[PDB]
Amino acid sequence: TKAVAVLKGDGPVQGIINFEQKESNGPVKVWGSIKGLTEGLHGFHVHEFGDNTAGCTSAGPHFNPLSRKHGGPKDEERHVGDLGNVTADKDGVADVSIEDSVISLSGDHAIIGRTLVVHEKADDLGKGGNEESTKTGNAGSRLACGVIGIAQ
Amino acid sequence: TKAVAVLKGDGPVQGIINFEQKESNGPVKVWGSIKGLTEGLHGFHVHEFGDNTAGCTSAGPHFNPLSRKHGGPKDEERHVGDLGNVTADKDGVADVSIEDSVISLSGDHAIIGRTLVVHEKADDLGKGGNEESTKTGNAGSRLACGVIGIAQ
Ligand SMILES: [Cu+]
Ligand SMILES: [Cu+]
Ligand SMILES: [Zn+2]
Ligand SMILES: [Zn+2]
Secondary structure (H helix, E strand, O other), X not given: XXXXXXXXXXXXXXXXEEEEOOOXXXXXXXXXEEEOOOOEEEEEEEEOOOOOEEEEXXXXXXXXXXXXXXXXXXXXXXXXXXEEEEXXXXXXXXXXXXXXXXXXXXXXXEOOOOEEEEEOOOXXXXXXXXXXXXXXXXXXXXXXXXXXXXXX | OEEEEEEEOOXXXXXXXXXXXXXXXXXXXXXXXXXXXXXXXXXXXXXXXXXXXXXXXXXXXXXOOOOOXXXXXXXXXXXXXXXXXXXXXXXXXXXXXXXXXXXXXXXXXXXXXXXXXXXXXXXXXXXXXXXXXXHHOOOOXXXXXXXXXXXX
């Protein structure tokens, strides 16, 4: 019903993101803060593995159990892990307060034990007009990540 | 089913611990290495929460879903999270190789999304002769921890 991810990297990006799901067939509330970001949009995705053995690279690809194309969170055609973009202000702080009905904290699409990643660049939401757009949204390198763990 | 925990803290203690469970009702193999430790025994436990918001303290208590008293891994009376001690050599390296049939990587009591912790002192296995012994094993402070994540 409740989880948390503490985001850390090799640079200045750090944050804490909370997840809450009241019902198993209900939406997941996702909220928290990330700091140390460049002003503007940054890709925000759940990746497949909760493996930090080689930094954020070890988390592997976007969590995509249904083998779909990359999209935005509002799209029917999207990865389970496609949570779009977070927005950082001029002081580099991104306040996050979204709701999603595709991710879950239980069942086959459970994101517990997987990795939340915030990216270098904006997610183009599959609308970038190149092959990479429908794979990763061209969001670039992984600035910070954290395993999604069970919280009180 | 496979998992991994990358142990980090505020000091020299770091390690990678792998988990593998070939069958959902079979033993979990736990192996890896921890370095930066003092020579001797160090408490080695799964804690309830995969929460690193305030360091290793945020992981909360020993994972104990069946509400049992603290013990050693061989004891019938023990917490699910009671994996005993790891032994560090004169170089400060603990090679970990154990099998456990109480913990699981799947089901309602799965340890995926929870926290693996290595401790300052030896776990006394509930035989230290005081109140704290039968609660936590008197293993002292938490030197390093990591959320247990899904691995490839
Ligand atoms: Cu991502
Ligand atoms: Cu512990
Ligand atoms: Zn995606
Ligand atoms: Zn215990």
